[PDB]
Swiss-Prot record, chain A:
Name of the molecule in the record: NADH dehydrogenase [ubiquinone] 1 alpha subcomplex subunit 13
Chain ranges passing through the membrane: 27-46
Coiled coil spans: none
Similarity section: Belongs to the complex I NDUFA13 subunit family.
Section of the entire sequence shown: 32 to 74 of 144
Localization (cell): Mitochondrion inner membrane; Nucleus
Classification of source organism: Eukaryota, Metazoa, Chordata, Craniata, Vertebrata
Record note on quaternary structure: Complex I is composed of 45 different subunits. Interacts with CARD15, but not with CARD4. Interacts with STAT3, but not with STAT1, STAT2 and STAT5A. Interacts with OLFM4.
Protein function: Accessory subunit of the mitochondrial membrane respiratory chain NADH dehydrogenase (Complex I), that is believed not to be involved in catalysis. Complex I functions in the transfer of electrons from NADH to the respiratory chain. The immediate electron acceptor for the enzyme is believed to be ubiquinone. Involved in the interferon/all-trans-retinoic acid (IFN/RA) induced cell death. This apoptotic activity is inhibited by interaction with viral IRF1. Prevents the transactivation of STAT3 target genes.
From Swiss-Prot, chain B:
Membrane topology of this protein: Single-pass membrane protein
Location of this fragment in the whole protein: 2 to 46 of 84
Gene for this chain: NDUFA3
GO cellular component, one term: respiratory chain complex I
Keywords linked to the UniProt accession: Acetylation, Electron transport, Membrane, Mitochondrion, Mitochondrion inner membrane, Respiratory chain, Transmembrane, Transmembrane helix, Transport
Family: Belongs to the complex I NDUFA3 subunit family.
Function of the protein: Accessory subunit of the mitochondrial membrane respiratory chain NADH dehydrogenase (Complex I), that is believed not to be involved in catalysis. Complex I functions in the transfer of electrons from NADH to the respiratory chain. The immediate electron acceptor for the enzyme is believed to be ubiquinone.
Modified residues (N-acetylalanine): A1
Species classification: Eukaryota, Metazoa, Chordata, Craniata, Vertebrata
Record-given protein name: NADH dehydrogenase [ubiquinone] 1 alpha subcomplex subunit 3
Cellular compartment(s): Mitochondrion inner membrane
TM ranges: 17-37
Assembly and interaction partners: Complex I is composed of 45 different subunits.
Domain of life of the native organism: Eukaryota
Protein backbone atom coordinates (compact mmCIF):
# COMPACT_ATOMS: atom_id res chain seq x y z
CA UNK A 1 0.00 0.00 0.00
CA UNK A 2 1.14 3.51 -0.89
CA UNK A 3 0.74 6.33 1.62
CA UNK A 4 1.13 9.93 0.50
CA UNK A 5 -0.07 13.41 1.49
CA UNK A 6 -3.86 13.57 1.42
CA UNK A 7 -6.00 16.41 0.08
CA UNK A 8 -8.37 18.33 2.35
CA UNK A 9 -10.24 21.58 1.71
CA UNK A 10 -13.49 21.29 3.74
CA UNK A 11 -14.56 24.96 3.97
CA UNK A 12 -12.05 26.43 1.47
CA UNK A 13 -11.29 29.23 4.02
CA UNK A 14 -13.55 31.61 2.00
CA UNK A 15 -11.70 33.19 -0.92
CA UNK A 16 -11.61 36.98 -0.43
CA UNK A 17 -14.25 38.11 2.06
CA UNK A 18 -14.84 41.67 3.26
CA UNK A 19 -14.48 42.26 6.99
CA UNK A 20 -14.57 46.07 6.98
CA UNK A 21 -18.08 47.36 7.65
CA UNK A 22 -19.76 50.41 9.20
CA UNK A 23 -20.19 50.00 12.96
CA UNK A 24 -21.64 52.14 15.78
CA UNK A 25 -21.56 55.49 13.94
CA UNK A 26 -23.98 56.13 11.08
CA UNK A 27 -23.40 59.78 10.16
CA UNK A 28 -26.24 62.13 11.12
CA UNK A 29 -26.80 60.31 14.44
CA UNK A 30 -23.27 61.13 15.68
CA UNK A 31 -23.90 64.89 15.26
CA UNK A 32 -27.04 64.60 17.45
CA UNK A 33 -24.86 63.22 20.28
CA UNK A 34 -21.85 65.43 19.36
CA UNK A 35 -23.55 68.85 19.28
CA UNK A 36 -26.02 67.52 21.90
CA UNK A 37 -23.15 67.12 24.38
CA UNK A 38 -22.08 70.72 23.65
CA UNK A 39 -25.55 72.19 24.38
CA UNK A 40 -25.71 70.09 27.57
CA UNK A 41 -22.15 71.26 28.32
CA UNK A 42 -22.83 75.02 28.31
CA UNK A 43 -26.15 74.79 30.20
CA UNK A 44 -24.56 72.78 33.05
CA UNK A 45 -21.48 75.05 33.22
CA UNK A 46 -23.25 78.45 33.22
CA UNK A 47 -25.58 77.45 36.10
CA UNK A 48 -22.47 76.88 38.26
CA UNK A 49 -21.18 80.37 37.34
CA UNK A 50 -24.53 81.83 38.49
CA UNK A 51 -24.00 79.93 41.76
CA UNK A 52 -20.47 81.42 41.80
CA UNK A 53 -22.10 84.90 41.70
CA UNK A 54 -23.82 84.09 45.03
CA UNK A 55 -20.34 83.54 46.51
CA UNK A 56 -18.73 86.44 44.57
CA UNK A 57 -20.92 89.30 45.92
CA UNK A 58 -20.73 87.75 49.43
CA UNK A 59 -16.90 87.69 49.23
CA UNK A 60 -16.61 91.40 48.30
CA UNK A 61 -19.23 92.27 50.97
CA UNK A 62 -16.70 91.18 53.64
CA UNK A 63 -14.35 94.02 52.59
CA UNK A 64 -17.15 96.64 52.81
CA UNK A 65 -18.29 95.27 56.21
CA UNK A 66 -14.72 95.42 57.59
CA UNK A 67 -13.86 99.07 58.33
CA UNK A 68 -11.71 98.51 61.49
CA UNK A 69 -9.39 96.64 59.06
CA UNK B 1 -29.81 78.63 -6.14
CA UNK B 2 -26.53 79.59 -7.87
CA UNK B 3 -24.32 80.23 -4.79
CA UNK B 4 -26.36 78.96 -1.80
CA UNK B 5 -26.97 75.34 -2.93
CA UNK B 6 -24.06 75.02 -5.41
CA UNK B 7 -21.28 76.33 -3.11
CA UNK B 8 -22.22 74.18 -0.09
CA UNK B 9 -21.79 70.49 -0.99
CA UNK B 10 -18.53 71.28 -2.85
CA UNK B 11 -17.18 73.00 0.30
CA UNK B 12 -18.10 69.90 2.37
CA UNK B 13 -16.29 67.70 -0.19
CA UNK B 14 -13.22 69.84 -1.01
CA UNK B 15 -11.57 71.33 2.12
CA UNK B 16 -14.25 70.25 4.69
CA UNK B 17 -12.67 71.92 7.77
CA UNK B 18 -13.05 75.40 6.19
CA UNK B 19 -16.85 75.06 6.63
CA UNK B 20 -16.37 75.06 10.44
CA UNK B 21 -14.04 78.11 10.31
CA UNK B 22 -16.83 80.30 8.86
CA UNK B 23 -19.88 78.77 10.58
CA UNK B 24 -18.68 78.72 14.23
CA UNK B 25 -16.85 82.09 14.04
CA UNK B 26 -19.78 83.62 12.11
CA UNK B 27 -22.43 82.56 14.65
CA UNK B 28 -20.12 83.88 17.41
CA UNK B 29 -20.99 87.42 16.18
CA UNK B 30 -24.72 86.83 15.43
CA UNK B 31 -25.75 85.14 18.73
CA UNK B 32 -24.75 87.82 21.33
CA UNK B 33 -26.97 90.44 19.59
CA UNK B 34 -30.27 88.61 18.87
CA UNK B 35 -30.63 86.24 21.87
CA UNK B 36 -32.24 87.85 24.96
CA UNK B 37 -29.82 86.72 27.70
CA UNK B 38 -26.76 89.01 27.30
CA UNK B 39 -28.47 91.89 29.18
CA UNK B 40 -28.59 89.86 32.42
CA UNK B 41 -24.81 89.17 32.45
CA UNK B 42 -23.93 92.90 32.24
CA UNK B 43 -25.92 93.72 35.42
CA UNK B 44 -24.11 91.23 37.71
CA UNK B 45 -20.70 92.46 36.44
CA UNK B 46 -21.51 96.02 37.60
CA UNK B 47 -23.24 94.98 40.84
CA UNK B 48 -20.24 93.08 42.22
CA UNK B 49 -18.08 95.69 43.94
CA UNK B 50 -14.30 95.66 43.65
CA UNK B 51 -13.62 98.29 46.33
CA UNK B 52 -15.47 99.49 49.44
CA UNK B 53 -18.67 101.47 48.92
CA UNK B 54 -18.67 105.17 49.75
CA UNK B 55 -21.11 106.75 52.19
CA UNK B 56 -22.95 109.96 51.34
CA UNK B 57 -24.29 112.62 53.71
CA UNK B 58 -28.05 112.42 54.17
CA UNK B 59 -29.87 115.61 53.19
CA UNK B 60 -33.27 114.89 51.58
CA UNK B 61 -32.60 111.55 49.89
CA UNK B 62 -34.88 108.86 48.49
CA UNK B 63 -34.24 105.09 48.38
CA UNK B 64 -31.34 105.26 50.85
CA UNK B 65 -31.34 103.74 54.34
CA UNK B 66 -29.02 102.14 56.91
CA UNK B 67 -26.58 99.25 56.40
CA UNK B 68 -29.15 96.80 57.81
CA UNK B 69 -31.43 94.87 55.45
CA UNK B 70 -34.18 97.21 54.25
CA UNK B 71 -35.98 98.20 51.05
CA UNK B 72 -33.52 100.77 49.68
CA UNK B 73 -31.68 101.43 46.39
CA UNK B 74 -31.55 98.70 43.72
CA UNK B 75 -29.72 95.70 45.28
CA UNK B 76 -29.54 92.79 42.84
CA UNK B 77 -31.50 89.62 43.55
CA UNK B 78 -31.86 88.35 39.98
CA UNK B 79 -32.39 84.57 39.76
CA UNK B 80 -32.03 83.19 43.31
Amino acid sequence: XXXXXXXXXXXXXXXXXXXXXXXXXXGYSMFAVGIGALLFGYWSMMKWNRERRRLQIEDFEARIALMPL
Amino acid sequence: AERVAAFLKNVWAKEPVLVASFAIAGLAVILPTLSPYTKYSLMINXXXXXXXXXXXXXXXXXXXXXXXXXXXXXXXXXXX
